[PDB]
Amino acid sequence: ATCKITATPRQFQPALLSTSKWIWTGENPIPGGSNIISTRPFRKNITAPCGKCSVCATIVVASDDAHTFYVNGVRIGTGAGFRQGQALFVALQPTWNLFAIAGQNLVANSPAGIMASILVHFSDGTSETFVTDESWKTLRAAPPENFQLPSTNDSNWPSAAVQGAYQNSVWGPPVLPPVLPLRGSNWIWTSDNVNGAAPVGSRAFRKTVNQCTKVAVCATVLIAADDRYTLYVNGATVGSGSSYTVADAYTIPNLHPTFNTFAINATNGGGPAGVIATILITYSDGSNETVVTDASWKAIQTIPQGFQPPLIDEFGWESAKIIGAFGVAPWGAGMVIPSA
Amino acid sequence: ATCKITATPRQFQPALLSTSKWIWTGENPIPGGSNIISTRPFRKNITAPCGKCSVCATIVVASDDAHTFYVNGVRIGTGAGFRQGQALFVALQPTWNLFAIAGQNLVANSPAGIMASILVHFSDGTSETFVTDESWKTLRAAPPENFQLPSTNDSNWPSAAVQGAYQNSVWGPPVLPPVLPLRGSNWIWTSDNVNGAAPVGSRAFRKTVNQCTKVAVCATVLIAADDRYTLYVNGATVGSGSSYTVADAYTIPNLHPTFNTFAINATNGGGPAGVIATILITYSDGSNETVVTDASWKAIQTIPQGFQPPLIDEFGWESAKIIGAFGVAPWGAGMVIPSA
Numbered sequence: 037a038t039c040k041i042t043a044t045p046r047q048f049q050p051a052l053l054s055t056s057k058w059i060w061t062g063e064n065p066i067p068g069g070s071n072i073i074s075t076r077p078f079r080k081n082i083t084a085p086c087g088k089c090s091v092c093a094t095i096v097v098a099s100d101d102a103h104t105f106y107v108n109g110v111r112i113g114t115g116a117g118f119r120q121g122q123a124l125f126v127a128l129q130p131t132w133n134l135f136a137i138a139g140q141n142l143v144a145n146s147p148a149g150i151m152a153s154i155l156v157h158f159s160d161g162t163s164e165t166f167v168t169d170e171s172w173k174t175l176r177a178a179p180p181e182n183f184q185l186p187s188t189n190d191s192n193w194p195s196a197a198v199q200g201a202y203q204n205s206v207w208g209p210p211v212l213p214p215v216l217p218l219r220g221s222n223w224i225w226t227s228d229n230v231n232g233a234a235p236v237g238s239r240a241f242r243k244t245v246n247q248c249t250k251v252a253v254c255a256t257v258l259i260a261a262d263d264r265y266t267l268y269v270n271g272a273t274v275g276s277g278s279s280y281t282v283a284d285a286y287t288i289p290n291l292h293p294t295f296n297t298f299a300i301n302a303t304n305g306g307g308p309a310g311v312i313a314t315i316l317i318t319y320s321d322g323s324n325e326t327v328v329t330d331a332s333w334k335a336i337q338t339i340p341q342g343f344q345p346p347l348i349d350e351f352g353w354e355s356a357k358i359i360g361a362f363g364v365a366p367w368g369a370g371m372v373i374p375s376a
Numbered sequence: 377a378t379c380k381i382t383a384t385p386r387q388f389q390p391a392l393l394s395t396s397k398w399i400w401t402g403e404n405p406i407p408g409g410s411n412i413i414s415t416r417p418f419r420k421n422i423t424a425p426c427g428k429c430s431v432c433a434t435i436v437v438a439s440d441d442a443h444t445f446y447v448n449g450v451r452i453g454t455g456a457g458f459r460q461g462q463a464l465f466v467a468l469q470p471t472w473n474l475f476a477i478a479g480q481n482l483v484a485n486s487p488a489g490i491m492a493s494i495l496v497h498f499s500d501g502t503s504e505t506f507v508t509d510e511s512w513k514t515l516r517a518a519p520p521e522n523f524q525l526p527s528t529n530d531s532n533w534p535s536a537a538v539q540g541a542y543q544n545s546v547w548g549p550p551v552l553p554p555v556l557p558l559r560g561s562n563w564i565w566t567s568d569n570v571n572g573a574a575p576v577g578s579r580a581f582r583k584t585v586n587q588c589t590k591v592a593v594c595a596t597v598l599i600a601a602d603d604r605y606t607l608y609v610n611g612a613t614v615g616s617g618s619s620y621t622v623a624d625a626y627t628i629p630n631l632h633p634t635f636n637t638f639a640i641n642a643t644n645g646g647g648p649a650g651v652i653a654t655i656l657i658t659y660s661d662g663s664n665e666t667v668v669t670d671a672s673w674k675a676i677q678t679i680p681q682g683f684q685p686p687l688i689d690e691f692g693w694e695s696a697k698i699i700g701a702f703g704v705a706p707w708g709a710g711m712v713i714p715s716a
């Protein structure tokens with residue numbers, strides 16, 4: 037039923053909308069034509085290719101006018117708008133997954149459509165993108181009670197009707213959102229960072245997530261530092277960077293189910309210093325949680341040997357100091373963030 | 377307020393009663409004389425020696441007729457009897473600890489007394505024994521409400537009266553109980569142990585305790601194996617043994633506060649095979665929990681590299697097989713267990 041996960045941490049791979057289609061019901065046989073104010077269901081049971089297990093997914097979804105996105109009966113997000121997609125992350129069942137979307141047209145005589153890409157990551161480190169298209173099922177009626185549940189049978193539902201393609205539609209191509217926000221996160225450092233500068237040298241930072249009653253699956257990490265950083269998860273090297281204007285994103289497909297420690301060695305070459313990160317963890321029940329760099333991280337000025345292992349004694353580590361919320365001078369708000 | 381713990385795992389050190397005294401109230405000025413049916417309080421605030429922090433304690437207590445033992449206001453155990461002591465384990469405050477005992481004489485015209493040794497382990501790996509004696513406070517009356525709480529002031533209480541010594545009393549010297557029971561634990565192995573024998577070779581076993589809402593302090597481990605074992609905690613070597621008739625006991629004074637993994641490499645030289653263990657973990661709120669070898673342990677027949685680290689992927693590990701409860705042939709119930 038389950039597969040061994042041989043996937044290991046890697047550079048984050050953006051889900052793209054380029055191959056996706058806009059879908060609606062076809063109540064107006066003109067694609068992109070005038071549609072009535074209405075809410076409509078869309079469903080697709082997506083099976084895993086034989087020989088591997090699905091682990092988690094990066095989702096980008098756009099809508100005219102609004103949407104609610106469900107995975108295996110669990111509401112994962114609500115959003116609206118076709119100028120920019122919405123990023124969502126979710127843990128998956130190993131062999132099949134039911135994706136369901138309630139799409140909503142809010143404006144009379146206006147076009148209606150939903151578009152999504154679902155980039156599924158498999159237990160062996162491969163991935164595959166699935167899209168909204170005419171293989172999805174819909175109804176010419178409001179979403180029935182529990183339409184998003186696997187217990188609902190859609191075998192007799194009609195096929196969704198394609199309203200347009202990524203590069204040929206009334207909507208034009210939605211821009212991808214950032215993989216994760218840095219808004220809501222903080223530049224942190226050790227407490228020797230004062231008056232807008234820190235000493236030259238390397239500093240370590242640690243954050244543990246341990247929800248012992250849940251099952252963690254995948255993490256996505258967005259990180260940048262002035263001047264540079266090396267990132268570890270459970271003692272394993274994830275990646276390194278040396279830019280405070282271009283952030284790096286990583287996928288961790290092989291989290292421990294209950295206890296995970298993120299550790300950073302960040303180095304200041306002189307002058308202002310800080311490290312900032314946003315981390316989203318997916319859980320097997322469809323929930324998630326976000327961790328940001330803030331004062332709940334532990335920090336130390338002289339880095340000990342083994343600073344990155346998960347179960348070290350954190351005696352003598354201090355609370356990290358918040359230098360500023362994302363946006364403050366001198367770094368500003370212009371960080372280049374990878375697309376979701 | 378707190379100290380760095382430089383103590384590391386070691387062979388368990390028995391708390392001994394040899395220097396302890398029996399105490400009561402002195403309502404009968406004859407020590408060991410006739411006493412009335414009554415319940416009486418006994419209290420002692422024990423301070424840590426300057427320069428170090430107390431971490432946890434091994435306690436042995438005996439009574440005529442019965443007792444309830446409190447530490448910093450928390451009830452830690454109830455017991456009775458002077459022929460054999462009762463073993464108790466508890467986490468401690470770093471600089472001072474209030475020990476309180478409600479002693480009970482159940483039989484009219486009979487002697488009355490309580491006796492305890494408190495072997496305190498300090499953050500630097502040293503230890504010191506404290507005993508019941510005339511420095512404890514008591515009352516010639518039933519225990520007041522909340523007498524065991526630090527908020528009760530005993531400054532005007534009279535001194536307890538010594539009823540006898542370990543080697544000179546009406547009771548004679550209480551025998552020390554085993555450090556931990558093996559009764560209640562099971563011999564386990566991998567599932568190739570069938571028909572009373574297992575293949576020659578080494579097998580690994582893992583058990584994790586992760587109460588993410590509590591603070592773990594110390595563990596005491598009792599273990600034996602046919603033919604031999606090596607024991608690890610959080611990847612660090614604790615000890616080894618090669619006897620199935622003489623069990624080994626260990627103290628782990630430096631647990632991680634929330635996540636601890638016990639791992640065993642046990643080896644069969646041929647014939648019957650099994651490993652058995654009992655583990656007690658103390659928590660900072662005065663509570664504890666016991667873990668025994670049972671089918672909740674994970675086991676594997678080909679031991680992988682890194683089998684002992686805490687956060688490994690346990691895919692492919694099986695539930696350990698219960699060979700029998702402690703006492704079954706061929707090993708029987710005669711295991712020599714270290715004294716508490």
Ligand SMILES: CC(=O)N[C@@H]1[C@@H](O)[C@H](O)[C@@H](CO)O[C@H]1O
Pocket residue numbers: 131132
């Ligand atoms: C992954 C897969 O093939 N799942 C199918 C399931 O959808 C179906 O309901 C069942 C009927 O026996 O058979 C399973 O094998």
Ligand SMILES: CC(=O)N[C@@H]1[C@@H](O)[C@H](O)[C@@H](CO)O[C@H]1O
Pocket residue numbers: 471472
């Ligand atoms: C470990 C120790 O010395 N504790 C004492 C405490 O018992 C006393 O109530 C308090 C009064 O200021 O002073 C503290 O230092």
Ligand SMILES: [Ca+2]
Pocket residue numbers: 100101141142143146147148
């Ligand atoms: Ca519309």
Ligand SMILES: [Ca+2]
Pocket residue numbers: 262263304305306307308309
């Ligand atoms: Ca700098």
Ligand SMILES: [Ca+2]
Pocket residue numbers: 440441481482483486487488
């Ligand atoms: Ca008595």
Ligand SMILES: [Ca+2]
Pocket residue numbers: 602603644645646647648649
């Ligand atoms: Ca043997």
